[PDB]
Amino acid sequence: GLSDGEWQQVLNVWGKVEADIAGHGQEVLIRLFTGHPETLEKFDKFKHLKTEAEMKASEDLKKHGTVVLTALGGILKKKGHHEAELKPLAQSHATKHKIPIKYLEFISDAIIHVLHSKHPGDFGADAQGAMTKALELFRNDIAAKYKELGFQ
Numbered sequence: 001g002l003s004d005g006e007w008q009q010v011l012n013v014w015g016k017v018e019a020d021i022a023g024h025g026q027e028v029l030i031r032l033f034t035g036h037p038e039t040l041e042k043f044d045k046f047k048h049l050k051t052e053a054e055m056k057a058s059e060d061l062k063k064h065g066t067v068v069l070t071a072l073g074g075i076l077k078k079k080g081h082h083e084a085e086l087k088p089l090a091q092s093h094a095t096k097h098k099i100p101i102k103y104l105e106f107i108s109d110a111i112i113h114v115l116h117s118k119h120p121g122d123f124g125a126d127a128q129g130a131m132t133k134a135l136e137l138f139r140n141d142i143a144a145k146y147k148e149l150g151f152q
Protein backbone atom coordinates (compact mmCIF):
# COMPACT_ATOMS: atom_id res chain seq x y z
CA GLY A 1 0.00 0.00 0.00
CA LEU A 2 1.70 3.12 -1.31
CA SER A 3 0.40 6.65 -0.93
CA ASP A 4 -0.10 8.93 -3.90
CA GLY A 5 3.09 10.75 -2.96
CA GLU A 6 4.99 7.49 -2.80
CA TRP A 7 3.75 6.43 -6.22
CA GLN A 8 4.79 9.84 -7.49
CA GLN A 9 8.31 9.16 -6.22
CA VAL A 10 8.30 5.69 -7.78
CA LEU A 11 7.29 7.00 -11.16
CA ASN A 12 9.74 9.87 -10.87
CA VAL A 13 12.52 7.35 -10.23
CA TRP A 14 11.20 5.25 -13.06
CA GLY A 15 11.75 8.16 -15.43
CA LYS A 16 15.46 7.68 -14.78
CA VAL A 17 15.16 4.05 -15.84
CA GLU A 18 13.08 4.87 -18.91
CA ALA A 19 15.77 7.21 -20.18
CA ASP A 20 18.02 4.18 -20.58
CA ILE A 21 15.97 1.05 -20.12
CA ALA A 22 18.50 -1.28 -21.73
CA GLY A 23 21.42 0.06 -19.72
CA HIS A 24 19.48 -0.18 -16.48
CA GLY A 25 18.14 -3.60 -17.41
CA GLN A 26 21.58 -4.87 -18.30
CA GLU A 27 23.06 -3.63 -15.05
CA VAL A 28 20.19 -5.05 -13.01
CA LEU A 29 20.69 -8.50 -14.50
CA ILE A 30 24.47 -8.31 -14.20
CA ARG A 31 24.12 -7.29 -10.55
CA LEU A 32 21.75 -10.22 -10.04
CA PHE A 33 23.95 -12.74 -11.84
CA THR A 34 27.24 -11.66 -10.29
CA GLY A 35 25.81 -11.18 -6.81
CA HIS A 36 23.82 -14.43 -6.91
CA PRO A 37 25.37 -16.79 -9.46
CA GLU A 38 22.73 -19.43 -8.79
CA THR A 39 20.27 -17.12 -10.54
CA LEU A 40 22.22 -17.43 -13.78
CA GLU A 41 21.47 -21.16 -13.78
CA LYS A 42 17.78 -20.40 -14.26
CA PHE A 43 18.50 -18.88 -17.68
CA ASP A 44 19.37 -21.50 -20.26
CA LYS A 45 20.21 -18.61 -22.57
CA PHE A 46 22.67 -16.95 -20.17
CA LYS A 47 24.26 -19.86 -18.30
CA HIS A 48 27.06 -19.87 -20.90
CA LEU A 49 28.17 -16.47 -19.58
CA LYS A 50 31.24 -17.25 -17.48
CA THR A 51 32.53 -13.72 -16.84
CA GLU A 52 31.03 -10.31 -16.24
CA ALA A 53 32.81 -9.08 -19.37
CA GLU A 54 30.85 -11.67 -21.35
CA MET A 55 27.67 -10.55 -19.60
CA LYS A 56 28.44 -6.91 -20.38
CA ALA A 57 29.12 -7.77 -24.02
CA SER A 58 25.94 -9.85 -24.37
CA GLU A 59 23.40 -8.07 -26.52
CA ASP A 60 20.83 -10.69 -25.65
CA LEU A 61 21.29 -9.96 -21.95
CA LYS A 62 20.62 -6.28 -22.61
CA LYS A 63 17.63 -7.30 -24.67
CA HIS A 64 16.27 -9.39 -21.85
CA GLY A 65 16.98 -6.57 -19.43
CA THR A 66 14.75 -4.40 -21.59
CA VAL A 67 12.03 -7.04 -21.50
CA VAL A 68 12.24 -7.34 -17.73
CA LEU A 69 12.22 -3.64 -16.98
CA THR A 70 9.53 -2.94 -19.56
CA ALA A 71 7.34 -5.46 -17.80
CA LEU A 72 8.19 -4.05 -14.39
CA GLY A 73 7.57 -0.50 -15.55
CA GLY A 74 4.19 -1.46 -16.91
CA ILE A 75 3.35 -2.94 -13.53
CA LEU A 76 4.64 0.05 -11.59
CA LYS A 77 2.65 2.47 -13.71
CA LYS A 78 -0.51 0.71 -12.53
CA LYS A 79 0.19 2.05 -9.03
CA GLY A 80 -0.74 -1.25 -7.44
CA HIS A 81 -3.70 -2.05 -9.70
CA HIS A 82 -1.60 -4.61 -11.51
CA GLU A 83 -3.44 -7.91 -11.05
CA ALA A 84 -3.80 -8.50 -14.79
CA GLU A 85 -0.19 -7.53 -15.50
CA LEU A 86 1.25 -9.45 -12.56
CA LYS A 87 -0.75 -12.69 -12.95
CA PRO A 88 1.00 -14.02 -16.10
CA LEU A 89 4.42 -13.11 -14.72
CA ALA A 90 3.76 -14.82 -11.41
CA GLN A 91 2.47 -17.82 -13.31
CA SER A 92 5.33 -18.03 -15.79
CA HIS A 93 7.95 -17.49 -13.13
CA ALA A 94 6.48 -20.09 -10.82
CA THR A 95 5.43 -22.74 -13.31
CA LYS A 96 7.77 -22.41 -16.27
CA HIS A 97 10.91 -20.67 -15.04
CA LYS A 98 10.69 -22.00 -11.48
CA ILE A 99 11.99 -18.81 -9.88
CA PRO A 100 11.88 -18.86 -6.07
CA ILE A 101 10.56 -15.71 -4.49
CA LYS A 102 14.01 -15.28 -2.95
CA TYR A 103 15.34 -14.46 -6.40
CA LEU A 104 12.69 -11.77 -6.75
CA GLU A 105 14.02 -10.34 -3.50
CA PHE A 106 17.50 -10.49 -5.01
CA ILE A 107 16.45 -8.64 -8.13
CA SER A 108 14.51 -6.08 -6.09
CA ASP A 109 17.61 -5.24 -4.10
CA ALA A 110 19.64 -5.27 -7.31
CA ILE A 111 17.36 -2.59 -8.73
CA ILE A 112 18.01 -0.41 -5.69
CA HIS A 113 21.72 -1.04 -5.98
CA VAL A 114 21.74 -0.17 -9.67
CA LEU A 115 19.79 3.02 -9.11
CA HIS A 116 22.33 4.21 -6.56
CA SER A 117 25.18 3.12 -8.80
CA LYS A 118 23.87 4.94 -11.86
CA HIS A 119 22.42 7.96 -10.05
CA PRO A 120 24.65 8.50 -7.01
CA GLY A 121 23.32 11.36 -4.97
CA ASP A 122 20.21 11.49 -7.13
CA PHE A 123 18.29 8.60 -5.59
CA GLY A 124 17.20 10.18 -2.36
CA ALA A 125 16.06 8.53 0.80
CA ASP A 126 12.40 9.20 0.04
CA ALA A 127 12.79 7.81 -3.48
CA GLN A 128 14.52 4.70 -2.16
CA GLY A 129 11.77 4.23 0.40
CA ALA A 130 9.05 4.50 -2.20
CA MET A 131 10.79 2.30 -4.75
CA THR A 132 11.49 -0.30 -2.10
CA LYS A 133 7.85 -0.30 -1.05
CA ALA A 134 6.75 -0.64 -4.66
CA LEU A 135 9.07 -3.60 -5.20
CA GLU A 136 7.88 -5.15 -1.96
CA LEU A 137 4.30 -4.81 -3.14
CA PHE A 138 5.24 -6.41 -6.45
CA ARG A 139 7.04 -9.24 -4.69
CA ASN A 140 4.26 -9.68 -2.16
CA ASP A 141 1.58 -9.98 -4.80
CA ILE A 142 3.75 -12.47 -6.67
CA ALA A 143 4.22 -14.31 -3.38
CA ALA A 144 0.46 -14.59 -3.00
CA LYS A 145 0.22 -16.17 -6.43
CA TYR A 146 3.14 -18.46 -5.62
CA LYS A 147 1.33 -19.59 -2.48
CA GLU A 148 -1.82 -20.27 -4.47
CA LEU A 149 0.26 -22.46 -6.79
CA GLY A 150 2.11 -24.15 -3.94
CA PHE A 151 5.37 -23.06 -5.48
CA GLN A 152 8.50 -22.80 -3.36
Ligand code: HEM
Nearest residue numbers: 039042043045067068071072088089092097099103104107
Ligand atom coordinates in the same frame (compact mmCIF):
# COMPACT_ATOMS: atom_id res chain seq x y z
C1 HEM B 1 11.37 -7.65 -11.63
C2 HEM B 1 11.26 -8.98 -11.67
C3 HEM B 1 11.04 -9.72 -12.99
C4 HEM B 1 10.33 -9.37 -14.06
C5 HEM B 1 9.44 -8.13 -14.27
C6 HEM B 1 10.48 -10.40 -15.05
C7 HEM B 1 9.90 -10.40 -16.28
C8 HEM B 1 10.08 -11.38 -17.21
C9 HEM B 1 9.43 -11.42 -18.49
C10 HEM B 1 8.47 -10.32 -18.99
C11 HEM B 1 9.84 -12.52 -19.11
C12 HEM B 1 9.41 -13.03 -20.49
C13 HEM B 1 7.93 -13.46 -20.39
C14 HEM B 1 7.73 -14.59 -19.43
O1 HEM B 1 8.38 -15.64 -19.60
O2 HEM B 1 6.88 -14.45 -18.52
C15 HEM B 1 10.74 -13.21 -18.23
C16 HEM B 1 11.35 -14.39 -18.53
C17 HEM B 1 12.17 -15.05 -17.69
N1 HEM B 1 12.45 -14.70 -16.39
FE1 HEM B 1 11.88 -13.03 -15.46
N2 HEM B 1 11.31 -11.38 -14.54
C18 HEM B 1 11.68 -10.97 -13.29
C19 HEM B 1 12.51 -11.64 -12.43
C20 HEM B 1 13.13 -12.81 -12.73
C21 HEM B 1 14.14 -13.44 -11.92
C22 HEM B 1 14.65 -12.88 -10.58
C23 HEM B 1 14.51 -14.55 -12.55
C24 HEM B 1 15.57 -15.60 -12.17
C25 HEM B 1 16.51 -15.44 -11.24
C26 HEM B 1 13.76 -14.65 -13.76
C27 HEM B 1 13.87 -15.67 -14.67
C28 HEM B 1 13.33 -15.65 -15.91
C29 HEM B 1 13.59 -16.59 -16.96
C30 HEM B 1 14.50 -17.82 -16.82
C31 HEM B 1 12.88 -16.24 -18.02
C32 HEM B 1 12.85 -16.92 -19.39
C33 HEM B 1 14.00 -16.28 -20.17
C34 HEM B 1 14.13 -16.89 -21.54
O3 HEM B 1 14.52 -18.07 -21.62
O4 HEM B 1 13.86 -16.19 -22.54
N3 HEM B 1 12.92 -13.57 -13.85
N4 HEM B 1 10.87 -12.50 -17.06
